[PDB]
Design a binder for this molecule. Structure first.
Ligand SMILES: Cc1nnc([C@@H]2O[C@H](CO)[C@@H](O)[C@H](O)[C@H]2O)o1
Ligand SMILES: *Cc1c(COP(=O)(O)O)cnc(C)c1O
Length: 810
């Protein structure tokens, strides 16, 4: 069909067809008379899977032979999404499989929709890990992703009566064809117990044991025949466990609950024991696996030369004291030597500055669950503070500020401080974020060890986020500049010479229109809700959170509605405002925000006077698979977090690469995106970080904005009086009270500039040609945001390895 999808050779289509029938028969045990679409999906999955194994085996054999430095990316989250299409794309099998299934009388797109999203993540943090694995494989790095195989991933969101309802994500229900259980590599993980101090060394004894069983999933690079591994651990109780008889067997669930479910929190720390167990579980099993692999390559001096461990935030921070524990207690290395090795091996990536998201574990918890680790942490702290005291003599406050141990109500361990002390590199995820780290929360550490601090601006993989979700766009681009850009996104700059090309302008606009039509259709198919494909698609999809300010968007929507009601027969650019995202189950305000959005839709979407000029839709169950559908269809990307709160953001990059213009604050990567495309091609508004600080020094008083802005006042009064909740007049009292008295994110402060900016957006949309030309300028300069660039920087500046675009013989 289209170029970028590979060749549909005669021999290969024939081979695919026979292997498809072979799996349907032998693997699924079905014939064409009783097979269902799901059976066909699996038949296709196994067929595509077969093409991976050969490459997977030799890639691993290759690393064994050449023994390069290994990169271990530790994360409690890997938001992978679907695997079928991504695998076909990276193996250049998409057209062949499309043809083969066509000849078999099947629609491949229909089959792809059957695959369950592997939702082992909450949002940006987990998705970043997924994009990183894709880039590391594409850049030929000997990398391994290590995490937990949650039985239940992020919950499926159902909207009932306008409220979010959560239901278990039983993603393994029908089986997972992509994983390979490796029970032979099961490892023991210890919990509780006590520490015994003997003649030579301390011993951790009387522990409870939980087995870690690994499941391997292949990670194919883009057309380079490299297939890396993502190893996820599953909790298994030993067989002598708790060994009435029946109860003992049933209680095995206690130990196995460790890998049962993903904590559904995005940017929020919840200090629960189960979560701590998950964090240690992944770290303990992973480190043993890493050391075992290292030994089969005594000389731990070379350990840092053959191993790099990247900590995705502080979630796997226990890797530092666990590594020390193994080297000191088990390998018998002297402390100083063990510490040198640990520091040179570990690197830490910070993803937030929000106080409520930073991990601070109560000492009593570590004391009971991991007694030896607590002792090691105290020793690390003692030695670290001695270094601080020597560098800043007499500065007693600095000592207490930098301590890994926080005193107060209950003593806690600041995991971020632990990570900085035990890592040779600490990085932020966007230029502004990394600067904020050095100027604020990590200022003391930066002054002590400036060399440790770096920046690694985030990125997204252009395979899943362009070729896979937007083939139409990838095609018209390839038509002009070739396919090389798919693994070298910087080449998109060549599109700048087509900004005045009438044919290209027309094609770019055509692709967007087609995507919108397709999405508008999908909305009626699976969700039954009519929308106007000719309107501007204004979308804000991301987790629901106060700092992301979906509320600011809500205020704008109500403003638009009130303006139409005031002057009904006045022309306004038609808009379809789409907001989607999940709220953490225990985050009350976030759940109230979802209700507000649907409530607004209830009024706006049924007002005769508004007509098809304004529609407000809440996109249910936003997840990776849905992102692949809505992002290509978007015209306007809402990235409106309060300046200084969104460390980077990555959804912003996805929209830019897919032809949407951006309206946003100078926050996270938005700053670099605007810098790359040129501020004139971006819709920037609101306070800058400096303005926010000025407001805080003076004191934020929302009442002031309410008193000076009539339109804002009207909105608040509508919310308070029950205009959007007739049967329950005070339903949104908590929202109004927060907005008026304790809004940490200054929604009102950016209201005026936001509305004004939105007017300039509508003005430009009225001029199709100029809107598209600005779009081209954005797409053409989105190259810097490829995770290939991000990974290449991590590789060279942190891991000490060189990326390679060399194909392996297939
Ligand atoms: C903590 C934490 N939890 N989620 C995040 C997210 O991680 C993403 C990838 O770096 C960033 O782009 C987001 O701004 C950050 O909020 O940080
Ligand atoms: C990319 C992505 C995110 C991150 O979006 P931001 O707007 O940066 O918060 C979250 N969820 C999903 C499903 C994504 O694909």
């Amino acid at each position: 069909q289209i170029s970028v999808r590979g060749l549909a050779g005669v021999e290969n289509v024939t081979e695919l067809k026979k292997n498809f029938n072979r799996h349907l028969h032998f693997t699924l045990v079905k014939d064409r008379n009783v097979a269902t679409p799901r059976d066909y999906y699996f038949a296709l999955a196994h067929t595509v899977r077969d093409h991976l194994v050969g490459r997977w085996i030799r890639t691993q054999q290759h690393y064994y032979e050449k023994d390069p430095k290994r990169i271990y990316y530790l994360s409690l989250e890997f938001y992978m999404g679907r695997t079928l299409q991504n695998t076909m794309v990276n193996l250049a099998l998409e057209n062949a499989c499309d043809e083969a299934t066509y000849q078999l009388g099947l629609d491949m797109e229909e089959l792809e929709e059957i695959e369950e999203d592997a939702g082992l993540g909450n949002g940006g943090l987990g998705r970043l890990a997924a994009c990183f694995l894709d880039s590391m494989a594409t850049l030929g790095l000997a990398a391994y992703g290590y995490g937990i195989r949650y039985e239940f991933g992020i919950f499926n969101q159902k909207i009932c009566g306008g409220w979010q309802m959560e239901e278990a994500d039983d993603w393994l229900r029908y089986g997972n064809p992509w994983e390979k259980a490796r029970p032979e590599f099961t490892l023991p993980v210890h919990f509780y117990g006590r520490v015994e101090h003997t003649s030579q060394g301390a011993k951790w004894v009387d522990t409870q044991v939980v087995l870690a069983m690994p499941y391997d999933t292949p990670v194919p690079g883009y057309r380079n025949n490299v297939v890396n591994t993502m190893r996820l651990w599953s909790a298994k109780a030993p067989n002598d466990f708790n060994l009435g008889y029946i109860q003992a067997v049933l209680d095995r669930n206690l130990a196995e609950n460790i890998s049962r479910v993903l904590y559904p929190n995005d940017n929020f720390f919840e200090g629960k024991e189960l979560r701590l167990k998950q964090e240690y579980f992944v770290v303990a099993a992973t480190l043993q696996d890493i050391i075992r692999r290292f030994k089969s390559s005594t000389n731990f001096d070379a350990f840092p030369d053959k191993v790099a461990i990247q900590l995705n935030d502080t979630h796997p921070s226990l890797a530092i004291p666990e590594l020390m524990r193994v080297l000191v207690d088990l390998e018998r290395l002297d402390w100083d030597k063990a510490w040198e090795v640990t520091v040179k091996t570990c690197a830490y990536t910070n993803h937030t500055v929000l106080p409520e998201a930073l991990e601070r574990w109560p000492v009593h918890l570590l004391e009971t669950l991991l007694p030896r680790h607590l002792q090691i942490i105290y020793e690390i702290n003692q030695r670290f503070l001695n270094r601080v005291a020597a560098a800043f003599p007499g500065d007693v406050d600095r000592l207490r500020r930098m301590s890994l141990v926080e005193e107060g109500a209950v003593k806690r361990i600041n995991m971020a401080h632990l990570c900085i002390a035990g890592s040779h590199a600490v990085n932020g995820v966007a230029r502004i974020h990394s600067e904020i780290l050095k100027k604020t929360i990590f200022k003391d550490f930066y002054e002590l060890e400036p060399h440790k601090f770096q920046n690694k601006t985030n990125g997204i993989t252009p395979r899943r986020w362009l070729v896979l979700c937007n083939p139409g766009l990838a095609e018209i681009i390839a038509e002009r500049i070739g396919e090389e850009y798919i693994s070298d996104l910087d080449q998109l700059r060549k599109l700048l010479s087509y900004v005045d090309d009438e044919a290209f302008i027309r094609d770019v606009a055509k692709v967007k229109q087609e995507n919108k039509l397709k999405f508008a259709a999908y909305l009626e198919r699976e969700y039954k809700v009519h929308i106007n494909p000719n309107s501007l698609f204004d979308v804000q999809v991301k987790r629901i959170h106060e700092y992301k300010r979906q509320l600011l968007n809500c205020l704008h929507v109500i403003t638009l509605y009130n303006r139409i009601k005031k002057e009904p027969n006045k022309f306004v650019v038609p808009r379809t405002v789409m907001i989607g995202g999940k709220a953490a189950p225990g985050y009350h305000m976030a759940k109230m925000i979802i209700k507000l959005i649907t409530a607004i839709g209830d009024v706006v979407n049924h007002d005769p006077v508004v007509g098809d000029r304004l529609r407000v839709i809440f996109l249910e169950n936003y997840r990776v698979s849905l992102a692949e559908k809505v992002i290509p269809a978007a015209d306007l990307s809402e990235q409106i977090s309060t300046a200084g709160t969104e460390a980077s953001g990555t959804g912003n990059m996805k929209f830019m690469l897919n032809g949407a213009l951006t309206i946003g604050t100078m926050d996270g990567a938005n700053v670099e995106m605007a810098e790359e495309a040129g501020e004139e091609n971006f819709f920037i508004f609101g306070m800058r970080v400096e303005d926010v600080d000025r407001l805080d020094q003076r004191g934020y008083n929302a009442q002031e904005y309410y008193d000076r802005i009539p339109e804002l006042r009207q909105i608040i009064e509508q919310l308070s009086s029950g205009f959007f909740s007739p049967k329950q007049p005070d339903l949104f009292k908590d929202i109004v009270n927060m907005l008026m008295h304790h809004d940490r994110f200054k929604v009102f402060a950016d209201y005026e500039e936001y509305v004004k900016c939105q007017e300039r957006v509508s003005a430009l949309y009225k001029n199709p040609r100029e809107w598209t030309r600005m779009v081209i300028r954005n797409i053409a300069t989105s190259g810097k945001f490829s995770s290939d660039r991000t990974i290449a920087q991590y590789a060279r500046e942190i891991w000490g390895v060189e990326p390679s675009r060399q194909r392996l013989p297939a």
